[PDB]
Scaffold this active site. Structure first.
Site, short mmCIF file in Angstrom:
data_model
loop_
_atom_site.label_atom_id
_atom_site.label_comp_id
_atom_site.label_asym_id
_atom_site.label_seq_id
_atom_site.Cartn_x
_atom_site.Cartn_y
_atom_site.Cartn_z
N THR A 136 0.92 -1.20 -0.08
CA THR A 136 0.23 0.07 -0.07
C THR A 136 1.06 1.09 -0.01
O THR A 136 1.97 1.22 0.78
CB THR A 136 -1.02 0.05 1.34
OG1 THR A 136 -0.12 0.06 2.37
CG2 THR A 136 -1.90 -1.16 1.10
N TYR A 137 0.36 2.11 -0.76
CA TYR A 137 1.32 3.41 -0.88
C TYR A 137 2.46 3.51 -1.69
O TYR A 137 3.02 4.55 -2.46
CB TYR A 137 1.61 3.69 0.45
CG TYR A 137 0.97 4.63 1.21
CD1 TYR A 137 -0.42 4.72 1.20
CD2 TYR A 137 1.39 5.61 2.45
CE1 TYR A 137 -1.48 5.25 2.03
CE2 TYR A 137 0.47 6.20 3.06
CZ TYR A 137 -0.95 5.83 2.99
OH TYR A 137 -1.95 6.66 3.74
N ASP A 194 1.26 -2.45 10.95
CA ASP A 194 0.62 -3.39 9.85
C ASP A 194 1.38 -4.82 9.80
O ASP A 194 2.10 -5.01 8.67
CB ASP A 194 0.64 -2.64 8.57
CG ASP A 194 -0.18 -3.23 7.89
OD1 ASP A 194 -1.11 -3.98 8.00
OD2 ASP A 194 0.05 -3.03 6.29
N1 X44 Z 1 13.62 -5.90 2.30
C1 X44 Z 1 12.75 -6.50 1.73
N2 X44 Z 1 13.30 -7.69 0.60
C2 X44 Z 1 12.31 -7.96 0.02
N3 X44 Z 1 12.32 -8.99 -0.73
C3 X44 Z 1 11.63 -9.98 -1.11
C4 X44 Z 1 12.04 -11.11 -1.83
C5 X44 Z 1 11.39 -12.14 -2.27
C6 X44 Z 1 9.97 -12.07 -1.81
S1 X44 Z 1 8.91 -13.40 -2.24
N4 X44 Z 1 7.22 -12.94 -2.46
O1 X44 Z 1 9.07 -14.25 -1.20
O2 X44 Z 1 9.19 -13.82 -3.66
C7 X44 Z 1 9.67 -10.96 -1.28
C8 X44 Z 1 10.25 -10.13 -0.79
S2 X44 Z 1 10.76 -7.11 0.48
C9 X44 Z 1 11.59 -6.10 1.55
C10 X44 Z 1 10.87 -5.00 2.11
O3 X44 Z 1 11.57 -4.33 2.72
C11 X44 Z 1 9.57 -4.88 1.88
C12 X44 Z 1 9.26 -3.25 1.77
C13 X44 Z 1 7.86 -3.08 1.71
C14 X44 Z 1 6.99 -4.00 1.58
S3 X44 Z 1 5.10 -3.80 1.35
N5 X44 Z 1 4.37 -3.49 2.94
O4 X44 Z 1 4.45 -4.87 0.99
O5 X44 Z 1 4.90 -2.66 0.59
C15 X44 Z 1 7.41 -5.67 1.97
C16 X44 Z 1 8.65 -5.74 2.18
#
Ligand code: X44
Length: 294
Positions: free
Chosen positions: A14-15, A123
């Site tokens: 979100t955002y 959240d």
């Molecule tokens: N640091 C970091 N690393 C990430 N990697 C990653 C790699 C693979 C997969 S996966 N679906 O398993 O293949 C998922 C994430 S994400 C993330 C965030 O710092 C972050 C920033 C914003 C949000 S948000 N509230 O959704 O906007 C969520 C996480």
């Protein structure tokens, strides 16, 4: 940004949208969140920037906050998988209890830390929990919406999960306490154990009523002041509390005991992260390495 090379789009938070990217300059791989009518949320931006000093092994490091071209970029250290994917991948077998216990313990350490620094996440959900091959798990994307708030979507149509929302928020509290994070984490703990979302509401009222059907409709005895809350309605149905043994089978009594304290209706009775770390459920906690398919 020009200094980055989008590798792939990760999430649709979100955002903003989250991308995996490489720093053209350093070659370091990071998670990059891009955010954004006008006005310049200078106050929000200040708050977000304060999070950069949040340094803990269980908190995703916020490397930079770049305001430019009517866009806000948050640069985070990259982790390879989130808990949502891991849980989905572990749906057939379930996550080993020792691993569930290790993750819960680490996340409470993370919350104990940010809460002692007066920082709330607001959240928590599986998509905001990231894991690595070393067995660590970390808190990602703190909301502190106490500055930017929350409209109805991300910014351009997209459903937002209410499954981990504390009851006081659903009842219109206005002033969240650190207790809202404990509630969300309790919901996540239950989901890791049962492999099913604890309260999968599809609307605010459905969310609230799913909570009531399981934990009993709250009253002044268990939650003083509840009947005076902004969105409380005397017309709410009155459900009796279900037996807990039915909620998270086959979690042991230490686990059920801890979960019950994380899910107390009254924010003041809900266990703190610091106290939860001392619960006997963690007597035999270890740090297993997960089997991750990247
Ligand atoms: N640091 C970091 N690393 C990430 N990697 C990653 C790699 C693979 C997969 S996966 N679906 O398993 O293949 C998922 C994430 S994400 C993330 C965030 O710092 C972050 C920033 C914003 C949000 S948000 N509230 O959704 O906007 C969520 C996480």
């Amino acid at each position: 940004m020009e200094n980055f090379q989008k590798v792939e789009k990760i999430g649709e938070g979100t955002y903003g949208v989250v991308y995996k990217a490489r720093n053209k300059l350093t070659g370091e791989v990071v998670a990059l969140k891009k955010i954004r009518t006008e006005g310049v949320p200078s106050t929000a931006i200040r708050e977000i920037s304060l999070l950069k000093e949040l340094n803990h092994p269980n908190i995703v490091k916020l490397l930079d906050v770049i305001h430019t071209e009517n866009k806000l970029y948050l640069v985070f250290e990259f982790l390879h998988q989130d808990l949502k994917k891991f849980m989905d991948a572990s749906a057939l077998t379930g996550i080993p209890l020792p691993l569930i216990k290790s993750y819960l313990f680490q996340l409470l350490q993370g919350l104990a830390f940010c809460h002692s620094h007066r920082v709330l996440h607001r959240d928590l959900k599986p998509q905001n929990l990231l894991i690595n091959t070393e067995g660590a798990i970390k808190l990602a994307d703190f909301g502190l919406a106490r500055a930017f708030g929350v409209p109805v979507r991300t910014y351009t149509h997209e459903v937002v999960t209410l499954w981990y929302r504390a009851p006081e928020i659903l009842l219109g509290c206005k002033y969240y306490s650190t207790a809202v994070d404990i509630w969300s984490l309790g919901c996540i703990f239950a989901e890791m154990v049962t492999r099913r979302a604890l309260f999968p509401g599809d609307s605010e009222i459905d969310q609230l009523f799913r909570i009531f059907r399981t934990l009993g409709t709250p009253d002044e005895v268990v939650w003083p002041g509840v009947t005076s809350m902004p969105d409380y309605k005397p017309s709410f149905p009155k459900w009796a509390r279900q037996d807990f043994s039915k909620v998270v089978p086959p979690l042991d009594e230490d686990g059920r005991s801890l979960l019950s304290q994380m899910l107390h209706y009254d924010p003041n009775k809900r266990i703190s992260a610091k106290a939860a770390l001392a619960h006997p459920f963690f007597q035999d906690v270890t740090k297993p390495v997960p089997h991750l398919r990247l």
